[PDB]
């Protein structure tokens, strides 16, 4: 997508050279933000193949509030086979925190579904947010949240979201990551009757890997297609009901599928 | 401030428009992302005048991790005047968040000293944030965190900082917020034997309200003025020593100041 690719050539034209943490060594640019206007259509980037089946049942699981990876071995999506531990547990990561962020005067917090009354009852809120980053319980997840934290907004009946991301791949991760999060406006969008409006990607340190710059440039060699649309199949009772089947993606005509490998 | 004018113009010439609670009215964007080279000087708005004494104190206010306003008190500071209780008592505000955020368990984390020592020990890391917006205890707090969440970067020995605010009132807000987390950034940056390097303020719900318009066409028809310098005469034994004589601000050669209600 334009405003991808646009990241890219500013990542290698102004990053900053590194060596990192496994020494594997990054260009980086700090703070960055790009838009994108769902109703132009489904931000899937079309200059490489994605395939989001694991992103759909990834984010149904996050819904969930469930941090085992049971139900995604059932559905053969090994995203976090790396990182959890041999009962299959990853600690109050995403979902958990999403869905019951621990209250210690006992009970728990369901972010989505405070989220989604806002948006129904009090539309014009300017703090319909959601965050992963419980500062208390990091220690205890398998990873540091990367996506941290999300706000909604509402303006003639379209509804929008920004997303800030701490750290971002921007080759291997960031197009999974766009797609993850407009996938879920278009749920919270439907759920509550409103059209999309647009979501608003924030990064902070973005990076291409030293080892994705032939395929960075090969892909900067190509051209951007039409965007795909996304289709729900059917309205759930809730934000909680869907199911892997819902969603169809149509019109994606993307250049051939990149490999690289991953840091 | 160029950029600071960009977006009073952008949200004049982009912004809906939005008649809600009590009738207070705006026009509001959702999503802005500007950035300011702290080496090309401090940026403290020159087409009003503004004043950093009451910013400097709750600055140091934040940084003691006390939210009782009994210091705001004795420097004749009315900032959160309206909304301590009988005792000046604010709840878990961002100084507490910042110092002491309450864990499950029996504890209190300590986000400054963790940030001081990641960029000591560790510059890389993407993880270098600090968050005010402690979910499990926002229904304690006087108001919701508005500047609710920044992270730091380090690039060629130069502090850079981003920081998320949920809500802004671009005319009245804003000014004062871009320098609060520019001389934090100062203050961290002196600490930390590092150069300054850029603030990036991101935002959501952006906002100008309906009864600034008068103050709004005036600001924007003034040329901005060379960004002043700040100065800071002595380097403290630790971020938690800053005392408020410490600072200067010298060439700032404002537009007189504009009057106007606050909502
Ligand atoms: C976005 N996330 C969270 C995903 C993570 C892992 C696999 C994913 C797959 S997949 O199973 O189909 N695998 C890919 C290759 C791949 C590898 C890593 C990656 O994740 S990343 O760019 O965000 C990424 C890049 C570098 C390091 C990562 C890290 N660290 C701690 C090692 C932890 C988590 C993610 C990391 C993204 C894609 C393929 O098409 O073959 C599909 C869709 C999303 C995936
Ligand atoms: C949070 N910060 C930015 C500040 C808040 C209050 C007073 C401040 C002053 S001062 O003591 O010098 N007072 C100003 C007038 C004023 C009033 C509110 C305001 O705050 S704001 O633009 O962020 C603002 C605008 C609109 C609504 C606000 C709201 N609510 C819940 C009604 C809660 C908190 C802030 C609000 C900014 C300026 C003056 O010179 O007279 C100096 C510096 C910062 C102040
Ligand atoms: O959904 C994700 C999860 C992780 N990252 C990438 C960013 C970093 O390159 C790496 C995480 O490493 P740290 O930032 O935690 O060091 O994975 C993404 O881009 N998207
Ligand atoms: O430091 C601050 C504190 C508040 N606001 C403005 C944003 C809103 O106009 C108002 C807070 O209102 P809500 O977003 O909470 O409704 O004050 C700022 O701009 N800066």
């Known amino acids: 997508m334009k405003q991808y690719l646009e990241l890219m050539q500013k990542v290698l034209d102004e990053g900053t050279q ?14 960055h933000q790009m838009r994108f206007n769902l109703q132009d259509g489904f931000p899937l980037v079309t200059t490489k193949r994605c395939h989001l089946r694991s992103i759909i049942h990834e984010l149904l699981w996050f819904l969930q509030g469930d941090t085992n990876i049971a139900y995604l071995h059932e559905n053969n999506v090994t995203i976090w086979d ?3 531990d041999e009962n299959g547990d990853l600690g109050p990561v995403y979902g958990k925190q999403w869905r019951a962020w621990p209250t210690p005067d006992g ?13 129904k009852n009090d539309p014009d809120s ?5 965050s ?16 941290a934290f999300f706000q909604f907004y509402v303006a003639d009946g379209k509804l929008s979201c920004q997303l800030y991301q701490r750290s971002c791949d921007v080759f291997l991760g960031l197009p999974f990551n766009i797609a993850s999060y407009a996938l879920l406006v278009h749920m919270m969008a439907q759920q509550c009757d409103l059209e999309v409006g647009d979501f608003v990607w924030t990064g902070g340190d973005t990076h291409l890997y030293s080892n994705h710059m032939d395929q960075t440039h090969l892909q900067l060699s190509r051209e951007p297609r039409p965007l795909p649309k ?34």
Not at 132 to 147: F, I, Q, R, T
């Open 18 to 31: 590194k060596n990192d943490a496994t020494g594997t060594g990054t260009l980086s640019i700090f703070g």
């Open 82 to 84: 790396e990182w959890a």
């Open 107 to 119: 009970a728990h917090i369901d972010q989505i579904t405070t989220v989604l009354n806002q948006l």
């Open 126 to 130: 300017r703090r319909i947010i959601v």
């Open 132 to 147: 992963a980053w419980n500062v208390g319980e990091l220690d205890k997840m398998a990873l540091a949240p990367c996506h």
């Open 230 to 263: 996304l289709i729900i199949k059917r309205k759930p009772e809730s934000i909680f009901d869907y199911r892997f089947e819902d969603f169809e993606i149509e019109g994606y005509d993307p250049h051939p599928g990149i490999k690289a490998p991953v840091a």
